[PDB]
Amino acid sequence: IVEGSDAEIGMSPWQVMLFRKSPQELLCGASLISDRWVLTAAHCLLYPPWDKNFTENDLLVRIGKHSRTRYERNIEKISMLEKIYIHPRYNWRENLDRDIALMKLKKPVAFSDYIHPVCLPDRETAASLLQAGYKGRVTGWGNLKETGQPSVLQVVNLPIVERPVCKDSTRIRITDNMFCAGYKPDEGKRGDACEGDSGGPFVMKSPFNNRWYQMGIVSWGEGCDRDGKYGFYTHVFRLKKWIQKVIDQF
């Protein structure tokens, strides 16, 4: 995260770190959506251009963390993957359309003060909150700049951007399954996700029921916090039927 702040303890208790066994390494963010299911971006798991194609046993999830590097004994919980599922129409060849995957945990985890699932949006929540100018929050342990890295989880609040502005910021052909967020050049604030933040959550707090909803997945960006560029996020509600499919089925 670029131009974020250090998170408060327990501020994002659904945040999950995707962690490589060897070398023992931060790969991506992710999110806890129940006691045995983790949501992330497809490209954290399968990205042919980087030679990335992870199997289950290559990866761990670490839940309840705050420190990027330290093993947070008696706080974090390290979990192993039973199965990885990638949206079948995930497009890695072109624009990262349907950049979404589910991970099924070997064992259900106990919730705690630092471990707690986020809500997934329903149609009405999406239609209400996913509006240009409304802000969400992105968290992660990714890099502090393009260029380096944080000691603890970073947080930044970013506004959702009008779709035509998203489209005119890039040569990439945007789909209806993604949205963009970030401040425009003449706005006073800046901030962006950066490398190592992908697969983490873009959340919003409902003013109706006070609950946190995961509206996006950190998907891609060209650079980090460049003027006139914006981060792109997988549109979680648009893919919810696929989510519910998988879950009412494994």
């Binding site: 023992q24 390494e25 931060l26 590097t69 330290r70 093993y71 390290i78 192993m80």
Partner: peptide, 8 residues
């Protein structure tokens, strides 16, 4: 990165 418990 701090080494994790081998058990995992």
């Amino acid at each position: 990165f701090e080494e994790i418990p081998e058990e995992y």
